[PDB]
Each structure stands twice: as structure tokens, then as C-alpha cells.
RNA sequence: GGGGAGGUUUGGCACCUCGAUGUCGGCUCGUCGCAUCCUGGGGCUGAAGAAGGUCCCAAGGGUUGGGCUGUUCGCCCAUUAAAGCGGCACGCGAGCUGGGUUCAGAACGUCGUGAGACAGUUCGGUCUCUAUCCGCCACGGGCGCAGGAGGCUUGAGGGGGGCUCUUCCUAGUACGAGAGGACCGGAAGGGACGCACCUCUGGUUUCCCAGCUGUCCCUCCAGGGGCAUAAGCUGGGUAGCCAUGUGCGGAAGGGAUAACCGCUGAAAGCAUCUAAGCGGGAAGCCCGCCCCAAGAUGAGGCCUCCCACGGCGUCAAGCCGGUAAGGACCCGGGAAGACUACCCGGUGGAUGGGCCGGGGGUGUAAGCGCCGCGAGGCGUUGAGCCGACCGGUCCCAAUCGUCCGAGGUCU
RNA sequence: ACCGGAGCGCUGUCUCGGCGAGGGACCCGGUGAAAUUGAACUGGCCGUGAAGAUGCGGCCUACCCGUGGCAGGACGAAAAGA
RNA sequence: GUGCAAGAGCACUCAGGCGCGCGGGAGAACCCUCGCCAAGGAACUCUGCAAGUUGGCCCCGUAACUUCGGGAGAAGGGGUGC
RNA sequence: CAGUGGAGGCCCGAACCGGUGGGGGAUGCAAACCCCUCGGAUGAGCUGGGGCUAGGAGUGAAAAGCUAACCGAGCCCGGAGA
């Protein structure tokens, strides 16, 4: 309401570039020891258990 | 590389040992090697250990006296090799490290705050005349 | 450190007792003043009828400072009180017998008859 | 900057001390307790302290502990059991492991404080 | 034009004959000649210099075939002299002789994001009287309508530290050649344990 | 006029926006004995600079005046 | 008495803006002009020397602290090499201040019968967390660089810096009756500033150690904890981060050149630095030193590593899985860091954590013995405790694994 | 708790800043506004134009998209100028 | 309730009731709130604005002036635990 | 003079009442708030409940202040599509 203030509606074109790297990304995960499960990294896992 | 600290370590050779013991809390004077005019010299400096600044080499140490009025307080390096003897001459109960209140109350007060630490008194006038008794036979 | 508003205890018998720093002379713009240095300094009390009165405005040197002086040999020194010594401009003191010891920098300043006057040339 | 330091706490003082106390607590009581990545690694250096300080046995170390633990039955427990189960294995009285779950609402990465064995 | 790598091992003082002296301890291991570079084989004179031991297995890279092309232990760093080809197949501490005075180079630390008070040295503001907003702003930074912009390069809060710096007319103190050490005038960019180059400075 | 510098500056006094920025404001010194006056009575600079050497001059007049009949 | 320049002042028009272009000073940050205050170079002098006057060339850098007032301005104080004048909405309030001016209250003087009025004075009086675009300071992502990849570099171009004083030697000589007092060259110390560092000096160090009051509590005595801040208070403090602390820079040297001195030399038999030509000569111009930099789409260079189509495209240009060198994800962490990026390490391991040795900080723990009616003291003791700094050791944790990624156009 | 002058004491008001504490800023997960808004593909200088240019002229410069931060301009917002 | 001269003040704590309806990390500039500092001590600045110095109690002591009550807590100083 | 006695728009200082100076807040926690500081504090004191006074009128230790969050003449309907 102040001083800051938006000189003019941005384009809808200029508005999706900004969300260019706004893109998510996959997680990563492994095939585990026990089941074929994809466990993350460095990580134990519900229904499969660990060991030491 | 594994060796940061015996480095630095190395250089240090300009060690010495022919220093005596001194704690926080007890008089010492020390004899300098102080240039003149353009000679040497050796001006002594009678006065009490305020600080001990211990770092390895280079380890400081503070000493502050009555002159004329005026407390002055000296700064030396312990192993500067300008520092041709320095003598023990009383000390006492330490109680504390660094004693800078001292400096607020220079009096008779002072004597009274700083008792004798007749342990290292033993400890040190025992040990001088013994060890002298065995050096000699 | 001396600076101009500084108060100075006067070691010698100019009859001054105080004096607060005017300007540091020295460089164009100097902006401390440690021992060895002289001074322009207004003098702000003294003894009835000494040899130089109040508002006398005065040129003076540091003999002794607060603020620790680094020696070249690792050493230091370091005083209880910031005071110095009204001078000539032949940089003689105007005064004879000045008490209160000094440092060994006045030496390597010309003012021999300063640290000859003074008795604990430390 | 200035993280030339060593480790790095949440909260004020009183309270994240109190908070390793009693993570400690809590831990020599269940040995096996779930919590936040980071707690857990800082929760780790305290307690293989008290581990290795009660694998003394001066009631000075005794008191010296109490300072942290308040439980007189818990410490007792602590030079009983839980000291000798670790004797000659000097250091790493514990363990830390990562979790795959997730704190709901807040996203929070869960792990594991395992007393080693 | 003598060169030399080393690292910031740390920082003490000596004693000349009879006054204090500040002195930075360098560490000038040897350093293997990699390749000479000539102005027929490139269009400069230079040598590329090693340093550190490596673990021949994180050497897997091609630079295996680099270092086998000169024979000689894989290095962890390699940079070059400038106007400097000197003998044999490595050099030494012994190439400088107390005295002569140096330029080193290295990576000043690294402070961040830094405040602009903190980097050029501003002034910031009041600390009582004004708003307690400026306490350490900038202030003001242009004009009006004209010019209307912003002189490039303008001193702005932002990164800094933490790069190429060189300090310059360090004299060389006593260098122990019986342990690669080297000693220099204290003052030296770079943390202790950073990689910094050893050069002749220019008194004339 | 070869002894006589004038010197002109923002008024002192209220007029708004203007005594801010239109200075008007006007004091002269005759060099040879360091004397000066000033005015700013009048929103016109120049009618101050009239008058205020109007004065410079009297006031000086009357110096000589005093000393030559002081002789 | 005459002719211009400049666009800093007052003034004259009233052309954009009254559905708003915040107005004086101060602060902060500056940049540009030269008609130059200083330093550097030079002609003339009523220039002996020094010092000075005046004019010319010259922005590279420099241009102090304080008293009075809201002041700009100005006077004064101490000093200085000098304490330059001006543009930039009299730079700068979506950066600050609000003392002034310019609302409401009050008063004096003063004008008015009055209500009221004042380039007259006086006391008081709300300054608006969120930056979309350009601009600027910093840091990433994506592609491009006619093959993929790792490591090291070239420097077109751009940036930073650029100041100066004083004392001594040559020499108390040249000059001068005397007082004074040299250029030239060399040495040394200093001021302000800038870059880097923690060795020393000295700051902080938020729980590193110790002491202290009141209170509640574990457990009655000791002993210990919580709270009294977001440390309860006090005394002291490594690492880190720091200036008051240590280090180093301005240049030297090369080249062209400004005013200016000079050589040769006409037109014009003489003469002249000039029209042909040539040499000297500024803190300034180019290079030289430090930093950035191949998005230098004009995408550079050197060293090194991998290399075949295996199935469709009749052709031109492509598509798809496996791949190689090599890269990425994940993890432990880092004087690197907002996030990201950069860097090290990942069992073939000392990366962090733990433990131990050391440095360092604190300054004689606990418990028991003894002296004293007691508060306490003494011994055991430089004990006990103990973050960051230096190093050791696989006890714990960096387990395992996965994806990407040339098969390289034409003459 | 009125306005002015001076002095003593004591101090980060200042020379001149430094370090540290915590609550926000920054990253991740959850929820999710506002004023404003002709349309936008929104560079610098010198001129230029109703006289202060991203948009006209000439010239120089500049791969595409962001994140953090500063406020010079968009005669920025706000209120149909007091 | 205990302690501080007393007190409904302050500190901690009974009985009782709460941890305030977004959290997790990171430990940049910058802002809020806060603690500290060498040497100097108002040079800051429209003004010591802000901050800090002093502080409770007991005893000694206390000027000009005065409407004789005041000025007085003038100023200045000593004591304070067990 | 001593003792007694306990007056005061007296003093210090919480509750309570009030806002001096600074800071934060400024699409706020809040259409007047928060923190530090500061005035009165047996008196022209503050406060609850019940009552009366109103628009050119009230009330006012007097500012043109207040009279239901903007009072140099309240608010709502109407003349009124002035
Ligand atoms: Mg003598
Ligand atoms: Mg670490
Ligand atoms: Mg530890
Ligand atoms: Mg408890
Ligand atoms: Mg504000
Ligand atoms: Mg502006
Ligand atoms: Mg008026
Ligand atoms: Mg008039
Ligand atoms: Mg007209
Ligand atoms: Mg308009
Ligand atoms: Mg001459
Ligand atoms: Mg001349
Ligand atoms: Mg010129
Ligand atoms: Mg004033
Ligand atoms: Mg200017
Ligand atoms: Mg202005
Ligand atoms: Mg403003
Ligand atoms: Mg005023
Ligand atoms: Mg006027
Ligand atoms: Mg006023
Ligand atoms: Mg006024
Ligand atoms: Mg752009
Ligand atoms: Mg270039
Ligand atoms: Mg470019
Ligand atoms: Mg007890
Ligand atoms: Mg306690
Ligand atoms: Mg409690
Ligand atoms: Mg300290
Ligand atoms: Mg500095
Ligand atoms: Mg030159
Ligand atoms: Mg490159
Ligand atoms: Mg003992
Ligand atoms: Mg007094
Ligand atoms: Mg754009
Ligand atoms: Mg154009
Ligand atoms: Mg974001
Ligand atoms: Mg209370
Ligand atoms: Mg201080
Ligand atoms: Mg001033
Ligand atoms: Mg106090
Ligand atoms: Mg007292
Ligand atoms: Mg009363
Ligand atoms: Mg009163
Ligand atoms: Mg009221
Ligand atoms: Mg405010
Ligand atoms: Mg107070
Ligand atoms: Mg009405
Ligand atoms: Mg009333
Ligand atoms: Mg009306
Ligand atoms: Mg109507
Ligand atoms: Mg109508
Ligand atoms: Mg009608």
C-alpha cells in the first residue's frame, strides 16, 4: 500500500518465465538389501528393517 | 603436513630455559638489556606480576610498580633475548590469574590483599640452599 | 592517546597543573598523539602566580600516556596518567626540575633536557 | 562467518541446554529415541560424554553427572548398567541413523539415536 | 623471475639481532616441473609447477597421462610462472636467499555477504538522534533526473573477501632449506592452509 | 569598489518557500579596516545591496569624521 | 570607453507539471567541470639567495579539527602542502534528520473600533514495515562455443591505485656588506588513505573455569541444579572475528606529449624553434604494478584421456537403448557460504563426532586427615574442571547404489 | 516532566568502529493477503520533441531466466493541491 | 510463604493455572531488543536527544537566599556480609 | 525550652488516575498500540450504579475543545432529481 508499489500488471508471459526454475525435481531412491523396495539413501525403511 | 603445530614449533628454537619460576601475585625485578644514548646498558625493573599472557612461545607477562608517584606497568616477551636475569625477589598468595585490582587500590591495602604464599616460600629457600649443599660435595 | 578535548597532568614546575590538548601538531591531519609528540594545549588550572596562568594557550610534548607504547625489542610500557611538558619554541621547557618519570622515546626526540630533569628515564 | 567455531544450537541457552539434558534423559532411559536430524547429531557428542565420564567411578564423576541428570535412580542405572555394557570401548558410545519418514505439517527430517550394541 | 607454491602454515615472530620482528612461516615443499611451456609450443615462457602427494587413485583422471608425460610422483595442485624457466626438475626454498624481497599471492577470507560498512569501510549513519533505520546504510547513492541512473562499479554491500590478493616487498627472513620452510615479512593473504605463489617483486 | 567585497546569502526569516531558495540576503566589507554590515528587510536582493552600502559608506564616513576631528 | 563568454546569483516571460515535481540547512554516498587552493612543469619580474608577485600548461590525487548561529554565509580559535570555486531539480527525505521555513495552541512588540494581521520576534507541534520495471552492487540456472572430457593458461577489453610533509649529508658552500640562504643529488622519519593479516598490543568471546546474594528444589549436613534476561551479578578468558595492533602499496623504468627552452633552416641573401626535419620537458597521456575477463557469438591456446553403427534414414537433416573417458545425484563436513555455487573427503577412509596426548583458559575440585567453640584456614594440589586451536586413533557415522554421458555434419 | 546559559561527574553522542546474544530477514514443509496495474518485446549517451525520453534521430553497448541486496529514474504510490 | 527497613514494590515459590493454535533448519547484509570495550571523554549535535552516573537503609555533615516553614535527600563523606 | 499531640490542594512511593521525553509500530497486535522513562498519588482525588442538560442548542479550569472513531455548528429522514 506504501511506497513499494507494482508500476504495471506483469505480462502473463513475463509472469510464467519467472517460474522457469520453479520447477520441482524427482527425489532419488535405491533398491534396498531386503525387499526390492526403493529405499533413500542412507536410510533404513518401514516393512524391510536394517541392520547393525 | 600433518605437522601445523611442531612447525611453527621448529622456528621456535630461539627458546630458553635460564628463566625461573613466577606466578600472579609475587615481586620480581628483571634486568634489560636497554640501549643508551648508543651503548648498552642494563636497567633493572623492581615490581610486582600483574599478568601472565600464556600462548606457547611468545608467552608475555605484565609487571606493574610504584615511581616517584607515578605506576608504571612493563610488558616483556619471556624468552626476548634482551632479557638478560630475571630475579625473584617475594612472592605471594596468588588467588586469582590476571589481578588488575590491584590497580584500584595501590596501598598498604595491597600488602594485606596479597598475603605470603609460605608454600612455594618453603618450597623455594629449601630447595636453593639444599640442592647447593649437594652440588658442592 | 592524547586528542584534542584530552586532559594532561604537568610533570614539570611550569606552575601549570592541568591542561587540556588544543590540536595535535603534526601531520596536516593528525588525528593521536602519543608519547614524543608535541602539542598546542590550553592550560586549564594552575598555581596562583606560577609562571604561566589559565587560558594561556601552550605548546607542550607527551612524556607519559594511558594507552600502552609498543617498543621495536617486543617491549611495552604503560603509565597511570597522561602528562606532559610546556615548551619553547626552541622546544626547551619553560620550567627547570620536572618530576614524574618519562619514556626512553624522548631520547630518540631531541629532548634531552627533559630526560637529564627527569628522574626515572624509563 | 564467524562459524570458524565449533557447532552450531537453536533456541537461547537455558533452553537449549536443558533441551540436550533432557534428550540425554530421555535417552539413558529408552536408549533408542527418534528426533530431528540435527538434534540427534548434537545430542550425540553430549551424552558419549556422560557415557565416558560415568565409565569412571569417583563419586566425583558420580556428581558430576548429576549436574545434567537429576534422576538419582537414572544415574545409578548409568554406572550399573549402562557404563560397564561400554567398557573398553573407548568413544562412539552411540549411534546416529537417518530416517526416510517425514515429519507431517512441518516436513521435518526424522533420525534415530541408537545407544550402540 | 623466481616462483614458487607453498601453503600458510601459520605465523609468529623471531628475533633479528636484537629487535622484535613479525614473520608469516611458508612452507615450500618441492615443486615438479610439469611442463615448460616455451613461446614455440604455446606463445609464453612459464613452467607448471606441482606440489602435495596424491592418492594415485583419485588421479584417475587423464591426468595421469600429464604427470607420466614428465614421470613424476601425481601432485594434488599445478600452477604455472610467468617468464621463469629455471633448471633441473624441481625447485626449492634454496632459490630464495635471505633478503631478497617477495610478492605472494593467495585467497584473501572469505567474509560473504558482507555489510557495506563492513566491506569499503563506510560510515554508515547517526546512532541517536536520526532514525534508528540508517544506523549502517548508505545513504544516498545518486542524483535526480539526471542522471537518472547508477555509476557502474558504485561501492554496494555484497561479497567480498575470499580472493586473489597480493601483497607485495615481503623481505625474505631466515628460510630453513631443512624442512622446506620460509620465512617472510608476517603480513600474507590467505587462512593457514591455504595455497599461495611466491614471486620477485618489482623495487626496480 | 577594489576594497569593498560583497557577500550575499539565503535570507533569515520567514517568506515560505521562497526565503529558502530566492536568497536575497546581503552583507558587504570593506577589506582595508574589516568593518561590515547587512541587510535583508526587502524580498529584493539588489534593494538591500543598495541600501546595506548606503550604510557601509555612512558608517565608515563617520569614522573619518570622528578621527579626523579626534586629531 | 568599447566587445564577448558563462548559465553560479537577483530579475524578466509564464512554455510542461495545481486528479501534487517535498521546499533551507546538516548526515550519508558521491560523480563531473577548470575559470587550479595545494603538490608537478614553465616564461617574465622592479627575479641576488631564500621568499614573493604575475601569466602559461596542467585534474592525477589531495583540500584538517573546533568555538558562535537552524543557517547557507561569515567572524574567530589551533594547525596545514593547501584548507579552491562550481554542475549535478542550489545532487541526494520511496536513504536519514526536521533545528529552520510552511497548519491548528500561546505570548510580546505592532497595525486595526473590531474580528484579525506581520521577508517582525518567541515557546510547542504526527516524516508513511513489503521494490513490479530500468539502473547498480553480489550469486546462481539454461543453452551456445559444429565430437565428448579433465587439468593448466593467453589477455582484446575493463577496473583499482595516483597525495604529501619534515630533519639531516653535499653545505653553512654558490649568492650576499650583513641577517640569511640554494638549485642538484642521496639518506631517514612522519600524516591521511588503501589492501592483507592475528605473531605482539588490545577489544569481544551467550556457559570456557571460578566466586556471589536471594529463593525454590534433589536428599537432613556437604555437594549440585533451576530462576532472577532474551547470561541473575561480578572477576578472568583460547579459537574465531576485529582497530587502537603488525605487514606492504603510491613508484622506479620505457615511450609519445602539454606549455616551454633549443638545434638546423627557408620563403624573405640578414633574421626566426617552423612551414620540411630533429632533441629536450609535467604528480599528467600510453605501457609498467594489483584485480576482473574468451557470452572476446571475432566463443581463443597448450598438455592429456575415450572413439566406431549395433537397429531405422534410399538422400539431405535426424531418432533410439547400451556405452567409453569423464560427469551428476546421495552422504560426512569446510576460515566457502543467505539458497545455490566453489572446495576436501566417502572404508582403497582420519571428513566430522567420540576418546587420548598437547596448547590454552580458569586458579589448589571432590572426599578424607589435621588446626580452631566458629565463620574458616592448612595438607593431599598447580588439583579439579575444561568450546572452537595442533595432532593421534576406525569406537560411531560418510553402508550399498543409481542416472547422465562421444560413436564426432559438408567442401 | 516549562524555555535558555555554564560547570562537575559518567558514558559508543562522537574520533570510529569492533565483537557477541536473542526476535525477524535467508533455505524447506503448511496456510496465504495488499496497495498498484492502458498494453509491453521496458539499455546507456548526445541531440530531440508542449521545454527533464526505455518508446522519435544518430551513435555506443548488450546471450536467455532468475535469487539475494541498494534505492537513482520510471516527473514512482497514496490524497480530482491544503 | 521466605528474604530485601516496611509494602498490594521487587526476586523465587505454595494452591491453582499456563508454555500465548504454524513448525523444521541455516547462523549473510540489514532492522528490532540487548550485553561489552582500549585510549580520549560531548570533540557528536539544533540541544548530553538517547544512553549511563547516582541509587535502599543507618550515622556524620549541609552554603547564598528566605515569606523563617523552607532552600535539604542541598553539596560531600563514612558504615552495610558472616 | 521539654514532652505530648498528629495538621497539610506537604514529601517518598505501589494500586488507581495521567501521558513528559526517546525508541518501536505506520496494509500495525491496535482506525492511537507496545517497551524504557516520567507526572499526581487525603485531594479542585479516582471510581460503580441511578438520574438531568442537545443543535444555533448543550456542556466547556476556554482548545472553538466535546456532544456515539473526521463538530467553526451533530446524526437520520424529508423539501430534493436543490
Ligand atoms: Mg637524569
Ligand atoms: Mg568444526
Ligand atoms: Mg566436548
Ligand atoms: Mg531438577
Ligand atoms: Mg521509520
Ligand atoms: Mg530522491
Ligand atoms: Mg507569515
Ligand atoms: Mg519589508
Ligand atoms: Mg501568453
Ligand atoms: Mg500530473
Ligand atoms: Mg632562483
Ligand atoms: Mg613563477
Ligand atoms: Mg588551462
Ligand atoms: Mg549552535
Ligand atoms: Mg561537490
Ligand atoms: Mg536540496
Ligand atoms: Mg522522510
Ligand atoms: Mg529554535
Ligand atoms: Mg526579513
Ligand atoms: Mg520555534
Ligand atoms: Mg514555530
Ligand atoms: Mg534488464
Ligand atoms: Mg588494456
Ligand atoms: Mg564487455
Ligand atoms: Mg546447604
Ligand atoms: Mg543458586
Ligand atoms: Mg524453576
Ligand atoms: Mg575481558
Ligand atoms: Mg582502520
Ligand atoms: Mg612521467
Ligand atoms: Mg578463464
Ligand atoms: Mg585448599
Ligand atoms: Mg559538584
Ligand atoms: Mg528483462
Ligand atoms: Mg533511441
Ligand atoms: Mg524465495
Ligand atoms: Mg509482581
Ligand atoms: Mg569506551
Ligand atoms: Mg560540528
Ligand atoms: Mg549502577
Ligand atoms: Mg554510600
Ligand atoms: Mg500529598
Ligand atoms: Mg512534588
Ligand atoms: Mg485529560
Ligand atoms: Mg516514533
Ligand atoms: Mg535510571
Ligand atoms: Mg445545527
Ligand atoms: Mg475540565
Ligand atoms: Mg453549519
Ligand atoms: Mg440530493
Ligand atoms: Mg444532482
Ligand atoms: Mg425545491
Given amino acids: 500500500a506504501k511506497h513499494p508499489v507494482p508500476k504495471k500488471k506483469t505480462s502473463k508471459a513475463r509472469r510464467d518465465a519467472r517460474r522457469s526454475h520453479h520447477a520441482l525435481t524427482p527425489p532419488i531412491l535405491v533398491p534396498c538389501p531386503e525387499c526390492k523396495a526403493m529405499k533413500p539413501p542412507h536410510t533404513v525403511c518401514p516393512e524391510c528393517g536394517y541392520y547393525a | 603436513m600433518n605437522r601445523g603445530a611442531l612447525i611453527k614449533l621448529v622456528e621456535s628454537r630461539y627458546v630458553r630455559t635460564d628463566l625461573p619460576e613466577f606466578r600472579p601475585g609475587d615481586t620480581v625485578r628483571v634486568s634489560y638489556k636497554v640501549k643508551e644514548g648508543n651503548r648498552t646498558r642494563i636497567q633493572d625493573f623492581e615490581g610486582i606480576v600483574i599478568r601472565i599472557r600464556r600462548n606457547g612461545f611468545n608467552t608475555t607477562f605484565t609487571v606493574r610498580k610504584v615511581s616517584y608517584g607515578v605506576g608504571v606497568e612493563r610488558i616483556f616477551p619471556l624468552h626476548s633475548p634482551l632479557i638478560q636475569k630475571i630475579d625473584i625477589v617475594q612472592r605471594g598468595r596468588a588467588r586469582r590469574a590476571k589481578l588488575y585490582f590491584i590497580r584500584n587500590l595501590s596501598d598498604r591495602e595491597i600488602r594485606r590483599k596479597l598475603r605470603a604464599d609460605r608454600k612455594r616460600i618453603d618450597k623455594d629457600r629449601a630447595a636453593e640452599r639444599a640442592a647447593k649443599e649437594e652440588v658442592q660435595k | 592517546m592524547i586528542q584534542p578535548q584530552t586532559y594532561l597532568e604537568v610533570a614539570d614546575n611550569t606552575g601549570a597543573r592541568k591542561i587540556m590538548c588544543i590540536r595535535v601538531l603534526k601531520g596536516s591531519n593528525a588525528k593521536y598523539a602519543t608519547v614524543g609528540d608535541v602539542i598546542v594545549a590550553s592550560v586549564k588550572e594552575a598555581i596562583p602566580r606560577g609562571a604561566v596562568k589559565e587560558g594561556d594557550v601552550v605548546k607542550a610534548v607527551v612524556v607519559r600516556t594511558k594507552k600502552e607504547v609498543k617498543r621495536p625489542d617486543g617491549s611495552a610500557i604503560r603509565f597511570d596518567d597522561n602528562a606532559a611538558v610546556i615548551i619553547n619554541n626552541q622546544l626547551e621547557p619553560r620550567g627547570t626540575r620536572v618530576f614524574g618519570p618519562v619514556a626512553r622515546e624522548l631520547r630518540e626526540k631531541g629532548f634531552m633536557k627533559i630526560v637529564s630533569l627527569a628522574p626515572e628515564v624509563l | 562467518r564467524h562459524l570458524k567455531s565449533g557447532r552450531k544450537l537453536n533456541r537461547h541457552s537455558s533452553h537449549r541446554l536443558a533441551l540436550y539434558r533432557n534428550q540425554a534423559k530421555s535417552l539413558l532411559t529408552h536408549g533408542r529415541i527418534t528426533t530431528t536430524v540435527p538434534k540427534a547429531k548434537e545430542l550425540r557428542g553430549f551424552v558419549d560424554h556422560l557415557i565416558h565420564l560415568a565409565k569412571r567411578g569417583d563419586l566425583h564423576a558420580r556428581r558430576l553427572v548429576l549436574r545434567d541428570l537429576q534422576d538419582v535412580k537414572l544415574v545409578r542405572k548409568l554406572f550399573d548398567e549402562i557404563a560397564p555394557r561400554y567398557r573398553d570401548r573407548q568413544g562412539g558410545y552411540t549411534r546416529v541413523l537417518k530416517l526416510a519418514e517425514r515429519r507431517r505439517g512441518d516436513g521435518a527430517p526424522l533420525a534415530l539415536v541408537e545407544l550402540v550394541e | ?204 | 569598489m577594489d576594497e569593498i567585497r560583497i557577500d550575499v546569502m539565503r535570507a533569515s526569516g520567514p517568506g515560505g518557500q521562497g526565503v529558502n531558495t530566492t536568497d536575497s540576503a546581503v552583507r558587504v566589507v570593506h577589506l582595508p579596516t574589516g568593518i561590515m554590515v547587512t541587510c535583508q528587510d526587502s524580498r529584493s536582493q539588489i534593494k538591500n545591496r543598495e541600501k546595506a552600502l548606503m550604510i557601509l559608506r555612512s558608517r565608515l564616513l563617520e569614522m573619518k569624521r570622528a578621527e579626523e576631528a579626534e586629531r
Avoid at chain 5, 70 to 99: H, M, W, Y
Fill in chain 5, 1 to 204: 623471475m623466481k616462483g614458487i607454491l607453498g601453503v600458510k602454515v601459520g605465523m609468529t615472530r623471531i628475533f633479528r639481532d636484537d629487535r622484535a620482528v613479525p614473520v608469516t612461516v611458508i612452507l615450500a615443499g618441492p615443486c615438479p616441473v610439469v611442463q615448460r611451456r616455451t613461446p614455440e609450443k604455446d606463445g609464453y615462457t612459464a613452467v607448471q609447477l606441482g606440489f602435495l602427494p596424491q592418492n594415485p587413485k583419485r588421479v584417475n583422471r587423464p591426468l595421469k597421462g600429464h604427470f607420466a608425460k614428465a614421470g613424476v610422483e601425481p601432485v594434488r595442485i599445478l600452477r604455472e610462472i610467468r617468464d621463469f624457466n629455471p633448471e633441473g626438475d624441481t625447485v626449492t626454498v634454496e632459490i630464495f636467499k635471505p633478503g631478497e624481497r617477495v610478492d605472494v599471492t593467495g585467497t584473501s577470507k572469505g567474509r560473504g555477504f558482507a555489510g557495506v560498512m563492513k566491506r569499503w569501510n563506510f560510515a554508515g549513519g547517526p546512532d541517536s538522534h536520526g532514525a534508528h533505520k540508517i544506523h549502517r546504510h548508505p545513504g544516498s547513492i545518486g542524483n535526480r533526473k539526471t542522471p537518472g541512473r547508477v555509476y557502474k562499479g558504485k561501492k554496494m554491500a555484497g561479497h567480498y573477501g575470499a580472493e586473489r590478493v597480493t601483497v607485495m616487498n615481503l623481505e625474505v627472513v631466515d628460510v630453513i632449506p631443512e624442512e622446506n620452510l620460509l620465512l617472510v615479512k608476517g603480513a600474507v593473504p590467505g587462512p593457514n592452509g591455504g595455497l599461495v605463489i611466491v614471486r620477485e617483486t618489482k623495487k626496480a
